[PDB]
Design a binder for this molecule. Structure first.
Ligand SMILES: CC(C)CCC[C@@H](C)[C@H]1CC[C@H]2[C@@H]3CC=C4C[C@@H](O)CC[C@]4(C)[C@H]3CC[C@]12C
Ligand SMILES: CC(C)CCC[C@@H](C)[C@H]1CC[C@H]2[C@@H]3CC=C4C[C@@H](O)CC[C@]4(C)[C@H]3CC[C@]12C
Ligand SMILES: CCCCCCCC/C=C/CCCCCCCC(=O)OC[C@@H](O)CO
Ligand SMILES: CCOC(=O)c1oc2cccc(OC[C@@H](O)CNC(C)C)c2c1C
Length: 439
């Protein structure tokens, strides 16, 4: 049965190396992925690669042989490297957390304030400082316990149990794990809050309309481009090409850039708003509404125009009277609900709750932030037990077993393999993985 562990432990090392060398190379070779965030992810993957190559294997040999085989020097270095990788990870995660806060609050929503060069420096500092705090206390022997069971393990070359004194145990854990952990959970929950608060009509309509850069057909079969910019009701592609050229002011050939579609969208939302205040029936309702329900109203007029939306006379009467669940029932009784539901259901829910709850993690940059959060969340779950039980061993020392300790450490080790999987949520990372896997 001890063979079982051997296979189990060998399969783990491989997945850590395979997975992480993939992530490293994906970013190194593909420009679409050479961003500040992915620079920090490289720092993360590096730490898990050194973990898999230099750390886990000698952890498996230690367990399976019930002894150290590698002498005192590598015993010390193995420990110092191990601690480094865990520390450099969590601070890198804390940095990712911080960088995303400054991005989401800056007018340049979703893009880092740091330059690529600036990001290289932060990483280098993280590694240098982590390299100090990890190696130095160990080479200088400041970590060491003085009780007999411990001093015996030191003089014995074949023993490499991590015995420390309670002072270092507290000091190392707080500075290495707890401080960057607690900052990261507090800061990143605040980035999640900013994403949701900063949601506006432009992102809303970008979610339930998409962006296509070449001429397509809507669900009605009318020619459309950009973010739901209708070209003509006519069923002639040349008439649609004719309208595009006039709307942009150049020969387009039925294709546009992201810059050109953005100002059509900006004119379209202006128009739907200008329509609202021009219309007799729509004007009052809009004023009565909070900035969120207002956005839902614009959304509709974007899809249907003022005349069509003013037709919901029953429902418009109640949004004005703040009777939210009564309007929502009358909006479901519609051709609009029938025609397209994935989109209507969201709009109605917005009118109902007055919240963005229906649009959570629908935007690409928001899906991107969720992934990062899943990395962070998983790292916490995998390591926290170990570190909690670490510090419980300092207070009442005779409560946690060596078997329990080692096992909780291995729940940590196995975290070095989860990131590459999680990154399969990113479409940019998928296309990258398959190109590299030749598929
Ligand atoms: C002490 C031993 C065991 C581990 C040390 C590994 C060192 C050499 C590695 C781990 C992580 C690495 C960094 C991670 C990725 C960044 C960003 C990249 O755009 C340039 C290189 C740079 C700046 C790397 C420099 C070297 C680095 C610090
Ligand atoms: C004890 C053993 C595991 C240590 C082996 C050292 C390895 C992990 C280090 C030493 C130099 C490092 C590399 C130096 C900089 C490059 C270029 C960068 O664009 C991506 C990271 C990458 C590819 C690093 C990956 C990790 C690396 C290969
Ligand atoms: C159950 C878990 C088992 C996991 C099974 C996986 C293990 C396979 C072996 C990995 C060794 C490491 C190989 C490194 C990865 C090679 C892929 C790669 O990086 O390719 C780049 C190349 O295409 C540039 O052009
Ligand atoms: C016993 C008291 O614990 C710590 O002081 C401590 O602080 C730390 C800070 C960061 C990383 C740490 O390593 C996690 C484990 O993979 C180490 N692998 C063992 C076998 C040494 C530690 C440790 C063990």
């Amino acid at each position: 049965w001890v063979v079982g562990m051997g296979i189990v432990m060998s399969l783990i090392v491989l997945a850590i190396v395979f997975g992480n060398v993939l992530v490293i190379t994906a970013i190194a070779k593909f420009e679409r992925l050479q961003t500040v965030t992915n620079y920090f992810i490289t720092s993360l993957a590096c730490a898990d690669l050194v973990m898999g190559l230099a750390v886990v294997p000698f952890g498996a040999a230690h367990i399976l042989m019930k002894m150290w085989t590698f002498g005192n020097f590598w015993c010390e270095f193995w420990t110092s490297i191990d601690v480094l990788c865990v520390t450099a990870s969590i601070w890198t995660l804390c940095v990712i957390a911080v960088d995303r806060y400054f991005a989401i609050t800056s007018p340049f929503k979703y893009q880092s304030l740091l330059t690529k060069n600036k990001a290289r420096v932060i990483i280098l500092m993280v590694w240098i400082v982590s390299g100090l705090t990890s190696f130095l206390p160990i080479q200088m022997h400041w970590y060491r316990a003085t009780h007999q069971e411990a001093i015996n393990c030191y003089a014995e070359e074949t023993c490499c149990d991590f015995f420390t004194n309670q002072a270092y145990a507290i000091a190392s854990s707080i500075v290495s794990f707890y401080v960057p952990l607690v900052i990261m959970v507090f800061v990143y929950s605040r980035v999640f809050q900013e994403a949701k608060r900063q949601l506006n009509i432009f992102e809303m309509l970008r979610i339930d309309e998409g962006l296509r850069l070449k001429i397509y057909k809507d669900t009605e079969g009318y020619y459309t481009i950009g973010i739901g910019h209708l070209l003509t009701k006519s069923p002639s592609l040349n008439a649609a090409k004719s309208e595009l050229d006039k709307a942009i002011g150049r020969n387009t050939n039925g294709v546009i850039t992201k810059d050109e579609a953005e100002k059509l969208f900006n004119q379209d939302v202006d128009a739907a708003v200008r329509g609202i205040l021009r219309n007799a029936k729509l004007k009052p309702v809009y004023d009565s509404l909070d900035a969120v329900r207002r956005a839902a109203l614009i959304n509709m007029v974007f899809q249907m125009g003022e005349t069509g939306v003013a037709g919901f006379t029953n429902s418009l009467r109640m949004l004005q009277q703040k009777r939210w669940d009564e309007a929502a029932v009358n909006l479901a009784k519609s051709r609009w609900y029938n025609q397209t539901p994935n989109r209507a259901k969201r709009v109605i829910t917005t009118f109902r709750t007055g919240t963005w709850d229906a649009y959570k993690f629908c935007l690409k940059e928001h899906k991107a932030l969720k992934t990062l959060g899943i990395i962070m969340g998983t790292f916490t779950l995998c390591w926290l037990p170990f570190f909690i039980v670490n510090i419980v061993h300092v207070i009442q020392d005779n409560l946690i077993r060596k078997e329990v300790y080692i096992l909780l450490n291995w729940i940590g080790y196995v975290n070095s393999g989860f990131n590459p999987l999680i990154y399969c949520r990113s479409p940019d990372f998928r296309i990258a993985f398959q190109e590299l896997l030749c598929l």
